Design an enzyme around this catalytic site. Structure first.
Site, PDB file in Angstrom:
ATOM      1  N   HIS A 107      21.651 -15.443  35.506  1.00 22.62           N
ATOM      2  CA  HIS A 107      21.208 -16.803  35.210  1.00 22.62           C
ATOM      3  C   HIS A 107      21.822 -17.398  33.950  1.00 22.62           C
ATOM      4  CE1 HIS A 107      17.832 -14.813  32.928  1.00 22.62           C
ATOM      5  NE2 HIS A 107      17.957 -15.869  32.146  1.00 22.62           N
ATOM      6  N   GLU A 137      20.227 -10.335  39.578  1.00 20.26           N
ATOM      7  CA  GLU A 137      20.350 -10.854  38.212  1.00 20.26           C
ATOM      8  C   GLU A 137      21.309 -10.062  37.336  1.00 20.26           C
ATOM      9  OE1 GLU A 137      19.592 -14.353  38.479  1.00 20.26           O
ATOM     10  OE2 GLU A 137      19.472 -13.820  36.359  1.00 20.26           O
ATOM     11  N   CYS A 193      19.015 -13.648  26.669  1.00 23.51           N
ATOM     12  CA  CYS A 193      19.334 -13.005  27.931  1.00 23.51           C
ATOM     13  C   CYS A 193      20.806 -12.615  27.975  1.00 23.51           C
ATOM     14  CB  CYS A 193      18.955 -13.846  29.150  1.00 23.51           C
ATOM     15  SG  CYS A 193      17.217 -13.571  29.620  1.00 23.51           S
TER      16      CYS A 193
END
Ligand SMILES: [Cl-]
Length: 173
Positions: free
Chosen positions: A32, A56, A139
């Site tokens: 993402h 992911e 992230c």
């Protein structure tokens, strides 16, 4: 176990987060955070990059050596339950903020409707300074642990509860 400077030099700003050079040609990140609609990554055309993403976890394998300063290190699909990992979070200033986490089970989960193939972990309150992992910009940060004299990378930061007490790294199947 302190991640050495060369290990931190692999952590690279990428998209809306970070990624990590596993080797001169292999870069990993959380899906993402990857920009979309782009024609290149790090100046290299899409046609010269082998992309492998699922759950992911995103891996790019460049056709040319992009970081020849680095040795290749081992990338594993998660780690044994109970392993203490360090999440190698950098901030924009270049400050290094390793987060110690105790890892739990590897599983497939749905997080915000996205399938995450990941490993849950718990932040170690007792191994971290008070007041990480809980802002979008974190992230993609790698989860690493030292096995013998070598560091292993086993996931990329993908999710955490509001408090940051429970985290999830995406792992490569
Ligand atoms: Cl290294």
């Amino acid at each position: 176990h302190h991640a050495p400077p060369t290990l931190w030099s692999r952590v690279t700003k990428f998209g809306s987060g970070w990624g990590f050079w596993v080797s001169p040609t292999v870069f990993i990140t959380t899906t993402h955070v990857v920009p979309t609609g782009v024609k290149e990554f790090f100046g290299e055309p899409l046609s010269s990059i082998a992309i492998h993403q699922a759950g992911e976890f995103t891996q790019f394998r460049f056709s040319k050596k992009m970081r020849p300063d680095l040795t290749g290190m081992v990338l594993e699909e998660g780690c044994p339950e109970g392993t203490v990992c360090s999440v190698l979070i950098k901030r924009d200033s270049g400050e290094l903020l390793p987060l110690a986490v105790r890892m739990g089970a590897i599983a497939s989960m749905r997080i915000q409707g996205r399938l995450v193939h990941g490993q849950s972990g718990m932040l170690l309150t007792g191994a971290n300074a008070k007041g990480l992992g809980t802002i979008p910009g974190d992230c993609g940060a790698p989860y690493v642990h030292k096995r013998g004299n070598d560091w292993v990378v086993c996931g990329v930061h993908a999710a955490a509860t509001k408090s940051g007490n429970t985290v999830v790294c995406a792992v490569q199947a």
